Design an enzyme around this catalytic site. Sequence first.
Site, mmCIF file in Angstrom:
data_model
loop_
_atom_site.group_PDB
_atom_site.id
_atom_site.type_symbol
_atom_site.label_atom_id
_atom_site.label_comp_id
_atom_site.label_asym_id
_atom_site.label_seq_id
_atom_site.Cartn_x
_atom_site.Cartn_y
_atom_site.Cartn_z
ATOM 1 N N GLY A 113 5.437 -4.447 0.375
ATOM 2 C CA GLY A 113 4.325 -5.251 -0.107
ATOM 3 C C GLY A 113 3.317 -4.481 -0.930
ATOM 4 N N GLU A 114 2.250 -5.173 -1.314
ATOM 5 C CA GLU A 114 1.156 -4.615 -2.120
ATOM 6 C C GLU A 114 0.276 -3.599 -1.341
ATOM 7 O OE1 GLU A 114 -1.358 -8.853 -2.050
ATOM 8 O OE2 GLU A 114 -2.488 -6.957 -2.030
ATOM 9 N N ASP A 166 10.763 13.675 4.694
ATOM 10 C CA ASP A 166 10.865 13.194 3.314
ATOM 11 C C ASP A 166 9.933 13.920 2.328
ATOM 12 O OD1 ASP A 166 12.143 11.345 1.471
ATOM 13 O OD2 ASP A 166 10.569 9.825 1.770
#
Lengths: 490, 501
Positions: free
Chosen positions: B175-176, B288
């Site tokens: 999402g945003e 990551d």
Amino acid sequence: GRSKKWKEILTLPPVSQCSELRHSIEKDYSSLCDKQPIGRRLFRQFCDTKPTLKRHIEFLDAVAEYEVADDEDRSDCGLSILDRFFNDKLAAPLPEIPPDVVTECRLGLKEENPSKKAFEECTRVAHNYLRGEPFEEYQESSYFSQFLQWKWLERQPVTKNTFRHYRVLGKGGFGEVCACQVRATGKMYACKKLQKKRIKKRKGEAMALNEKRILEKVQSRFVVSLAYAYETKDALCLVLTIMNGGDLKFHIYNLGNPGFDEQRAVFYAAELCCGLEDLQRERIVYRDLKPENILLDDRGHIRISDLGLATEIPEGQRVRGRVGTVGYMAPEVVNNEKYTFSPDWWGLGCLIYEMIQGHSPFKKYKEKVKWEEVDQRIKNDTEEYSEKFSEDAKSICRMLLTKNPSKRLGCRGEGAAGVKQHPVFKDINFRRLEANMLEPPFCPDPHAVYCGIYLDTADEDFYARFATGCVSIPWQNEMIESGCFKDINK
Amino acid sequence: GRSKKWKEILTLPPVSQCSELRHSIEKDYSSLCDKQPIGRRLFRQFCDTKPTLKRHIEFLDAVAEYEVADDEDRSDCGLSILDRFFNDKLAAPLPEIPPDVVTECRLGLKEENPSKKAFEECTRVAHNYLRGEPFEEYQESSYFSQFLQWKWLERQPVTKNTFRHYRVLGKGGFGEVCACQVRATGKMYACKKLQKKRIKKRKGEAMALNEKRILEKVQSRFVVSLAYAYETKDALCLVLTIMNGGDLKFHIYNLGNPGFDEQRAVFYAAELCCGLEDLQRERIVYRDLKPENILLDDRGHIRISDLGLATEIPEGQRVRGRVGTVGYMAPEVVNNEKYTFSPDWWGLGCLIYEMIQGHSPFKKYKEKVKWEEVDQRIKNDTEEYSEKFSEDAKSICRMLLTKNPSKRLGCRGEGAAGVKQHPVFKDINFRRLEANMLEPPFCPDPHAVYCKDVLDIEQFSVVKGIYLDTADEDFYARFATGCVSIPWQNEMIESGCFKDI
Ligand SMILES: Nc1ncnc2c1ncn2[C@@H]1O[C@H](COP(=O)(O)OP(N)(=O)O)[C@@H](O)[C@H]1O
Ligand SMILES: Nc1ncnc2c1ncn2[C@@H]1O[C@H](COP(=O)(O)OP(N)(=O)O)[C@@H](O)[C@H]1O
């Protein structure tokens, strides 16, 4: 028991191989000298060699004895501690204890109702001394080196071959639970096999990771303990505390009237109280208190099991949701309200009732009712009692089954500490119970019985998040309890 | 930008509605008087009412200034402490400190280049004193009653109405990400909206639950901090540290040579060391490490972001799996071996290299190479350097890019402490870096662009065939909402709301 090659499996490495571990390990006194069982045994062995330190340990062991003493024996313990460790006609064994602290003990022990916390400041000051130079000196001793050897063994690989897999004990949603024995020590456990295909089909990924984490965060005598975790081509396996005494649902219905004597219910509720307090100290809400989830051991002691729904609540936060089992859900739970630990206290009320009566408070045994109606009964209908319940048992149940959580027993700020103070637990010494020093009323009977998908890369990304293999404190306890620490340490 | 009716939003309850809180709060000194910023300020206020207690606070604060002191200033800083607290036999401010502890302290401070830990036993004894009767007395003070009031405010509901929603910052995978402001305080945050339909389709339930937990567990100036969590009918929202300065990928490539000066890279690598030390003391392996995952703030300080793959490892246990981004995976990772924190030190190696060189160690920029071949280069090929690198930069990269984790820098029992000790970091005072007293070499310019835009609209995505059922609600039940205590308390003080109440 132990395997033929047990000494080759549990062979301490040379001390030079422990160099990485030595420097990397965090030099925390509470962990290394107390909370880690092998660490505690080895620091005490080191203390035994230094007369001044040996007296400090004896003092701590004397205070621990006093803390668990019976009400009519407490003053005798306290007076004894004073005579042995604070004799004014003799030199000071514990010089670092300030005279004002000694004095305050003498005054609190004059009182006919002496506080079981009378030696806490003496205890705190003793540990302050021990965590100083004695701790420094211990780290430079042969005993610490030995602790590091055990710590190295502890981090050694864990596979299905670490165990002997015996008869299936039960069947769950993600797979089967079987009885397993550690090859090296002969310790028995329950091995819960969570089938990879079953986890994928039932979307139980977040659930499996949660249970694992919850079982390792909790250190309780009344919550099922995780000792190991491993992976096979087919499953993710949890090696848990073996409970071969059956569930409470078996004892209330299959062996019950339905129901059993108040004295048993009260004892089980006392233990459930301690379990809930242990969970709440870790800010965990269990969410699924029901008889089927409470298991009995060979000694007749209980443990909360099935920690799938249990969730850790961060400080300054609340959870919501209609989750649990139909008939056991609290009003705030069925209303999908925002709450914290309140559902568990309600759950305890349900358990005490079901144990005494012979059916859940808002659903009769076998009763064919739609969920939609059981929820309205929880929200509005009151629970009717009988003369199976004493006047005190009717009070704890009424207080725990109050619809409004903010007016419920254990949810008004008193916590489990308050719930324990209820007149039902009059005859129970919680310090003794919490220390495994109280015999259960009942004991389980020996001999007698008590009970298309294809894996992809997204599943591999889920297995990467699953760590193996042993759980530190349970492992060190297994090493001590099995005699392997004694027979290797010598 | 405080609310009009902020005093109405942040109204403290009567000390009767806190009676509950008083009995349920675990009396832990370290938590209530140090870790919790408001608890710390209130216990310090209580301490001001007693001259002996006030002196202990003055001492702890003087030792704190000693620890962050510049190498030349330190010796005189230490001497001033001795002069203020230990030079008078009939006027001793800290009597409980044994003279033998004071003797050892004077010894290590007599020499030139004194340990920054010279007063660490003095500090331990001062805290043992405070943890006793002063702490018990604090629990009956009016100051502690105020702490219970603030703790009651902290447990108060948090929804989408707690925030003023501003411009979209970026397009996330669930999402945003938008700029949002707490109405009552005016403090700016970044609100990561994780759409319920997107989490379902992507099967990110475990990931979201794990990210949330890790963000609340870590308390680091160098890791994005979670301050709040709330729920919407269509989203799960994480209110985070706003990072206006852009990410490192943008600075290396978009406005880089590719790459930027060694001086910038070394400051970032030093801040990364601190972040990795912070994650490791919480027994977390980030997994990551890559330029796009390191963000910059308005002042030029970095923070490790995107803690989606981050894993907490229980003591005595190991993880496995080939996870992360292609070109950034370590040999143990590509080979799917069992490991702990080793991939993060390799990751720091990959980051330093890229920042200085302008491309990752085993993949040139935008090169179309098969992942399998990239893996082979990681396992066998040795990374090549250039003159962009000083002799000490090549040293840190070669040591961090050691194929065997058991021989890699940070992975041999020295950890972050040993990495911080590398010659590249000679010009960095880590005590000041950790205390936020070092100015970065580069500071982002406002009005300047630091990310790809991103129209200030939408949230919209592929949601066909996605239906929220009972199983989804069983997941939302696990997602707690409200604030995150330490971030919340710091926000109340920083916004002046604590001071003005
Ligand atoms: N710790 C344990 N000791 C002995 N038996 C155990 C055990 N844990 C589980 N079991 C048995 O395995 C059965 C299924 O395990 P369970 O945890 O209830 O799976 P579930 N209800 O989530 O599907 C249990 O009902 C019980 O019979
Ligand atoms: N904490 C933050 N502060 C400011 N902006 C942020 C931010 N976190 C994320 N963003 C913006 O939103 C973009 C996407 O967020 P991202 O972290 O990649 O979410 P993800 N991993 O699900 O794709 C970032 O590249 C950045 O432009």
